[PDB]
Design a protein around this ligand. Structure first.
Ligand code: BCL
Ligand code: BCL
Ligand code: BCL
Ligand code: BCL
Ligand code: BCL
Ligand code: BCL
Ligand code: G2O
Ligand code: G2O
Ligand SMILES: CCCCCCCCCCCCCCCCCC(=O)OC[C@H](CO[C@@H]1O[C@H](CO)[C@H](O)[C@H](O)[C@H]1O)OC(=O)CCCCCCCCCCCCCCCCC
Ligand SMILES: CCCCCCCCCCCCCCCCCC(=O)OC[C@H](CO[C@@H]1O[C@H](CO)[C@H](O)[C@H](O)[C@H]1O)OC(=O)CCCCCCCCCCCCCCCCC
Ligand SMILES: [Ca+2]
Ligand SMILES: [Ca+2]
Lengths: 95, 625, 625
């Protein structure tokens, strides 16, 4: 359906937590090695011809690198299902 | 194992579960009471001594329930009193469990009158308004205990701090202050405001960690108190008694059963009488009581910090972590104090244990005369300062190393606890890269950057427990008189039997750290019961390696291969009898299961060090010249 | 640690390195020879006994070089002969190292004549054409040894298989057959064709694994041979000698140095004489020799299989794995024989150790009379079959468990070896999903599917070594007479003091499996040297846990935090003296380093079991009635 999910290549670390939640009838998530898997050479990816937009991949809040995005149906791009409100800070000392 | 997690329960179910648990406690205490019966008032030669009742016998003898004698009237009266108290405990426990039923299911209705009851008013809305009336509630418990002693057990309240009448006097003094403190908090609640919102995880974690230090305090208080002349009638009257335990070396029987057995004792397979004054029973019971509260106290501390992290992580995921005024949060929400605070604790931990470990090996080197050295070259002169020599009896070098091993052991575990407290969501390295922690239980992130194992806060809890073994075990050696000052002692090799005289020890310790194992197990091997505990403890412990090594994927290999053998073997030997497909624990379960086998296995064996005798002499061990 | 990897060397550098290593071996053998000197021919009271020379002394005494006597002429002649042989070894080793230089740098040129030399012809192109002339080369080594004995050491070749003259006779008999076998292979090379293409990894791995079984064979042959009446003049003439070792309990000295020390012995700090017949020295040396070849033999086997996997993986990555007609490949290139073969070996391993472990606990239960049982209820009657009772002296139950523990131990390690052999690139589960193995050393793949730790073939090698400890350690107990039949024995608890009586053992073993540790260490604690080895071995071993647990990411945390403390501490205590940034081992290095600390630490301690005495009596230990 709408709102595809689109794992980012350059940020992925290959932890594989994204791959767990995808239903076994849908093997939409896979691996790519192209090198030695100790300096980050087994990044995963999503197959768009099998994905059925479960949101199990995004709504689970598991990606630690922000590699899952879940682009919105019209044009919008997400990175995590909710973000804190970005305040700004200092130091205090009660005299 | 998360069926009773805090975010799923409301407030009443906590009260119901607590009442039910109190009832269960009453049942088991009554069970202990009738486990300590000797004669059965109708006359039915009862039970033999077991470690559960021998732990509480001094308290009963102090309260005038049990006694230290073997006569007609004494045992008959003691059994009757114990039966009465056990029945009373059973009755109150049944009532309490019924009340637990009543509070668990939201059903506060009177059985006699068709009345109801609202948990809101009957009062308090938040937990700070509840702190107040609780102090009034506890003032009643102190008041009742003073009444129970005075009315039933005698012991009129008298301020004499050498006999138990002072305890009755104190319970009335405390009821004054807890009541007076109760009213003021009912009118002026105090304020650490964050504990009321997620009040069943945040406030719980603070209480659990606070209870942990309290248990350690009573652990140390009991050790000092029980060795006073005032406590003499109840603790080292144990020495001049004779004990019959279960698992004692029994009256052996030959194959002629004829059969010249044993000493002249009419029962065959009789339990031999064991003297309780060659056996250091007065100290053995004291060690058992003290160590139980110390290890339980430490464990509550680790749990209290761990659950604080579970809450602490949660408020950083939704967004409120930025949103606290409580100073208990702003003092560490900076990421430059955290490095300084963690830096200054990991360096002090470095400076301390390196100092003691240098002393311990140097003393060990000096005995064996390795590299051509004498014992005169050892630190046999490093006594504590004279202003600190009151807290020790016979101050010496053995006390100096102990006072620092505890510091070195404690701060070694504090590193993990701090890293739970601060780096629950982000660490300087994890924010150095672009990375998260999101589950407080994720095992790793993969082989990227060389490996990312055990970074979550649950793993940090495991290492605090594992590092805490060294600190906890150091207590077992010290309270059993083990001369932790050098790692060999009493060994007939070069100079170990010299410590005595060059240091004027005026006592005689059992052995060194290594030689601790060869000695002591003279008595462990003499008992068949203690021998089985030795074998079981070692079997459980090493199984931890099956789940603690980096092998979970390897075990996932064989499970697949196994499934096909029990699959191909029900094929042409027996007919179709097989559908079972082997499960392997996940990494998170592997560490949880591994830590319990490691921690459980080692401390079932520590029991043998304590519950096998004291065996500390007072002979200065003249020189081996 | 891959500086000398095989894919980087050509053929000559192997020959050069081998020649250099042979020269080094000659140097160290000469060093041993002069380490075994007693008197120094000019007269200079020499060295005391050490374990390196005492291992080879029987061989020298058999060859008429050393002797068992303390006189004037005997020691003077023995020292001279040893010096001569050491000098000869030094000379030949220097020549061999120079030849290693000559072959390592592609410089086969004569120094006298301006000649050159081609490694191709001077011959052979492939390794099967080289097998032939080597057998001719070895026929010369056998021929020379017969010449060296006959011409120099006497011992004319005589076929009497009770004295050493048979050895001289055999070396001439062997030179006949190796020469005759050499010509035929020079004309008819044999054919396992795949070993010639990648010939410095494939052929090497087969040889290394083949040498491993050879070493185990000579390990067992020596144990049987050295206990024959023919070998009596060289091995249990050791018993009626007196030995002076380094690290012996020395002449102690008081603080008066005056100083009434010791026995009447003129040297102060003198080494006490130790009788070699109360001390079971005749068997101690035999145990030391045998165990060295057994453990080295096993290790070569694991390495040979591991390097075969490195080759086996490589030919599956380029594509030639599909491309072999060697039957040694087609018998397992199917993925349905592999499951059947691995299935039938993991089930036999299941059926065997469960049988012995059931017997061992049942015997252990029966002694301690747990659950109301007698020793008559134990398996004190399960002797080996009468057709198998020739291979044992005094057949009993202790032999039955040993013969099966070896099988159970061996097949337990074979599981890892098979999984190296077959699942180097793909496994049924890894092909069940879509996945690879590509590096033979990758540590894991991440927490996906619950965890993927230790699936590579290097990790499988580690588990074979770790599982092989149980099989290897069972040999140490058995050859030292440890009664592995029950886990407690000689223990004065219930019935462990009997055993011999009800079984008619006709010997007396030291102890049980657990009680093995309490005994034996009576002598270990008596020696300061053995005591230090005990402490060092245990220190090295437990450090394996620092790198074997799932904690590499946790250690990567502190290294970052540490770097900032030594960074913030050179800031305001001392001035700018700090740029160092702490490295943590990767998971692959962590397992490599962990396995060495685990394997190295445990076997430095096994040396203490062997090199502390035999202590096996011959008293049937009358009943404890
Ligand atoms: C010294 C007494 C300890 C204590 C010791 C125990 C023990 C022991 C148990 C509980 C158990 C529980 N405790 Mg409590 N508990 C204490 C203080 C608290 C506080 C608090 C201060 O806010 C809270 C919210 C709770 C809440 C709870 C629930 C998690 C649970 C009761 C339900 C049940 O099944 O039974 N405890 C104090 C700190 N609590 C029970 C439980 O469920 O454990 C899983 C349990 O076995
Ligand atoms: C040591 C005493 C136990 C306890 C033991 C019982 C038992 C037992 C019973 C009640 C029952 C009742 N308790 Mg109460 N109850 C306790 C603490 C509380 C608290 C609280 C802390 O806020 C509240 C609101 C209540 C309120 C109530 C009402 C729901 C109900 C009947 C009213 C009455 O007896 O008074 N109990 C303490 C912890 N309570 C009675 C009931 O509901 O019967 C239908 C009942 O049987
Ligand atoms: C929940 C938020 C309120 C609160 C109000 C109460 C009330 C009300 C009670 C406790 C209770 C306890 N509180 Mg509290 N508690 C708070 C702040 C704290 C702080 C702190 C700031 O350092 C500490 C160390 C404690 C620690 C404790 C233990 C001393 C005590 C009983 C332990 C247990 O098993 O239960 N609270 C804040 C002020 N706390 C119980 C207690 O025993 O009080 C005497 C109790 O009845
Ligand atoms: C019983 C004798 C063992 C043997 C024992 C050793 C030992 C021991 C060593 C070598 C070493 C080496 N062996 Mg070799 N080696 C044997 C048979 C072989 C065979 C073969 C049959 O094809 C090959 C190709 C090699 C090849 C090699 C190179 C890897 C290396 C020599 C270079 C160097 O630095 O020195 N060996 C036999 C099986 N070999 C040396 C090396 O480099 O190790 C890293 C080394 O220390
Ligand atoms: C036990 C004998 C050692 C050995 C020890 C030496 C030594 C030492 C020397 C040679 C030297 C030579 N050896 Mg050679 N050499 C050995 C095995 C070989 C093999 C082989 C296995 O294929 C070959 C091709 C050679 C070939 C050669 C020539 C490169 C060279 C001079 C020719 C000659 O002496 O004959 N050696 C064996 C392993 N060889 C000599 C040389 O080159 O001098 C410049 C030299 O000094
Ligand atoms: C390389 C391919 C040739 C080969 C030709 C040689 C030659 C030539 C030699 C060896 C050598 C050895 N070979 Mg090869 N080897 C091959 C096949 C085998 C097979 C097998 C098929 O099972 C085995 C078990 C062995 C095993 C061995 C050892 C018996 C022997 C010396 C061990 C070492 O350290 O070196 N080879 C094939 C036939 N092998 C050495 C040896 O000692 O031969 C007596 C040697 O000189
Ligand atoms: C006594 C301790 C152990 C076993 C018993 C055993 C059994 C076992 N292990 Mg193990 N193991 C370690 C200890 C033990 N591993 C350690 C300390 C490490 C860390 C180094 C370790 C590591 C690995 C890796 C990495 C792998 C395995 C496997 C694998 C399986 C192989 C199948 C097999 O050989 O069949 C044969 C299996 C048997 C004959 C088992 C029968 C026993 C009888 C019932 C004895 C009773 C056991 C016990 C006393 C009762 C339990 C009571 C307790 C709960 C109070 C097989 C079940 C492998 C698989 O899982 O699949 C192949 C694998 O990959 N391991
Ligand atoms: C005696 C054995 C051990 C230490 C000594 C030690 C030292 C240490 N460990 Mg450890 N460790 C284990 C054993 C030892 N871990 C085990 C068995 C496990 C598995 C459960 C284990 C696991 C973790 C995890 C998971 C983490 C650490 C760390 C961490 C660092 C913390 C920094 C600190 O406390 O400063 C204080 C550090 C010291 C005072 C070290 C000074 C000692 C003096 C020189 C004694 C000499 C040591 C030795 C005798 C000489 C070596 C000779 C040998 C090669 C023949 C710190 C260097 C952590 C870090 O790496 O960074 C924070 C971390 O995350 N561990
Ligand atoms: C964190 C930093 C805290 C610093 C505090 C230093 C700790 C001081 C320890 C030595 C105190 C001492 O031995 O008391 C001195 C007293 C008695 O003191 C001497 O003790 C000797 C013991 O062999 C003998 O009994 C002598 O008679 C007596 O003189 O010792 C105790 O009974 C202490 C009880 C056990 C204390 C456990 C502490 C709990 C820590 C466990 C945490 C591990 C994690
Ligand atoms: C794989 C399956 C192979 C099956 C082979 C069964 C193994 C049989 C072992 C018992 C043989 C035996 O004890 O020999 C019988 C002989 C002597 O036999 C008895 O031995 C007793 C030992 O206490 C006494 O010496 C008695 O005098 C003598 O009768 O024992 C040895 O000397 C054996 C030497 C050591 C053998 C090591 C085997 C190497 C295996 C290590 C691999 C571990 C990995
Ligand atoms: Ca003790
Ligand atoms: Ca021995």
């Amino acid at each position: 359906a709408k709102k595809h999910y689109f794992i980012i290549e350059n940020l992925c670390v290959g932890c594989g937590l994204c791959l767990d939640k995808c239903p076994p009838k849908v093997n939409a998530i896979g691996y790519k090695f192209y090198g030695d898997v100790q300096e980050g050479g087994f990044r995963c990816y999503i197959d768009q011809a099998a994905c059925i937009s479960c949101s199990a991949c995004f709504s689970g809040d598991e990606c630690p690198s922000g590699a899952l995005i879940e682009v919105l149906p019209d044009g919008e791009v997400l990175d995590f299902s909710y973000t804190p409100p970005e305040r700004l800070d200092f130091d205090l000392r009660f005299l | 194992y998360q069926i009773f997690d805090t975010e799923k329960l409301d407030d009443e179910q906590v009260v119901g579960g607590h009442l039910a648990l109190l009832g269960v406690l009453g049942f088991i205490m009554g069970i202990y009471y009738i486990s300590g019966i000797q004669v059965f008032p109708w006359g039915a030669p009862g039970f033999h001594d077991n470690w559960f009742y021998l732990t509480i016998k001094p308290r009963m003898v102090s309260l005038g329930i049990d006694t230290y004698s073997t006569k007609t009237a004494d045992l008959e009266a003691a059994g009757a009193r114990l039966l009465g108290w056990a029945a009373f405990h059973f009755l109150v426990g049944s009532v309490l469990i019924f009340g637990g039923w009543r509070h668990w299911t939201h059903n506060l209705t009177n059985p006699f009158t068709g009345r109801c009851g609202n948990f809101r008013d009957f009062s308090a809305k938040s937990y700070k308004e509840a702190l107040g009336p609780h102090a009034v509630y506890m003032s009643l418990l102190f008041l009742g205990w003073g009444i129970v002693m005075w009315a039933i057990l005698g012991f009129a309240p008298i301020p004499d701090f050498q006999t138990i009448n002072s305890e009755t006097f104190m319970s009335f003094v405390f009821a004054v202050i807890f009541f007076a403190l109760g009213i003021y908090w009912w009118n002026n609640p105090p304020n650490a405001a964050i504990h009321l919102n997620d009040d069943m995880k945040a406030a719980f974690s603070v209480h659990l960690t606070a209870i942990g230090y309290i248990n350690i305090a009573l652990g140390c208080i009991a050790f000092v108190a029980f060795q006073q002349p005032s406590f003499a009638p109840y603790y080292k009257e144990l020495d001049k008694l004779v004990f019959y335990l279960y698992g004692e070396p029994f009256n052996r029987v030959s194959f002629n059963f004829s059969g010249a057995k044993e000493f002249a004792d009419f029962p065959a397979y009789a339990i031999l009488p064991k003297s309780g004054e060659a056996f250091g029973m007065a100290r053995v019971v004291t060690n058992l009581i003290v160590f139980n509260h110390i290890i339980c106290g430490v464990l509550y501390v680790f749990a209290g910090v761990y659950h604080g992290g579970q809450y602490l992580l949660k408020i950083q995921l939704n967004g409120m972590y930025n949103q606290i005024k409580s100073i208990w949060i702003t003092k560490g929400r900076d990421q430059e104090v955290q490095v300084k605070i963690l830096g200054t604790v990991m360096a002090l931990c470095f400076a301390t244990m390196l100092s003691v470990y240098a002393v311990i090996v140097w003393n060990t080197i000096c005995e064996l005369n390795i590299f051509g050295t004498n014992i005169t070259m050892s630190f046999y002169w490093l006594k504590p300062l004279p202003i600190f020599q009151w807290m020790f009896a016979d101050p010496s070098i053995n006390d100096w190393v102990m006072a620092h091993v505890i510091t070195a052991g404690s701060l070694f575990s504090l590193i993990a606890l701090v890293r739970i407290a601060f780096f629950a969501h982000t660490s300087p390295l994890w924010d150095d890269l672009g990375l998260k922690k999101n589950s407080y239980s994720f095992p790793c992130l993969g082989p990227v950057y060389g490996g990312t194992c055990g970074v979550s806060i649950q793993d940090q809890l495991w290492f605090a427990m594992l590092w805490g073994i060294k600190g906890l075990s150091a207590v077992c050696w010290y309270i059993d008189g083990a001369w932790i000052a050098s790692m060999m002692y009493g060994v007939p090799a070069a100079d170990a039997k010299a410590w005595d005289s060059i240091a004027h020890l005026h006592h005689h310790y059992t052995s060194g750290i290594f030689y601790y194992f060869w000695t002591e197990t003279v008595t462990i091997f003499s008992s068949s019961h203690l021998s089985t505990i030795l074998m079981i403890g070692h079997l459980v412990w090493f199984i931890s390696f099956a789940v603690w090594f980096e092998d979970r994927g390897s075990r996932l290999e064989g499970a697949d291969i196994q499934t096909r053998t029990i699959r191909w073997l029900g094929k042409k030997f027996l007919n179709r009898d097989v559908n079972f497909r082997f499960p392997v624990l996940t990494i998170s379960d592997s560490k949880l299961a591994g830590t319990f086998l490691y921690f459980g296995g080692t401390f079932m064996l520590v029991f043998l060090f304590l519950a096998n005798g004291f065996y500390q002499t007072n002979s200065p061990l003249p020189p081996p010249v």
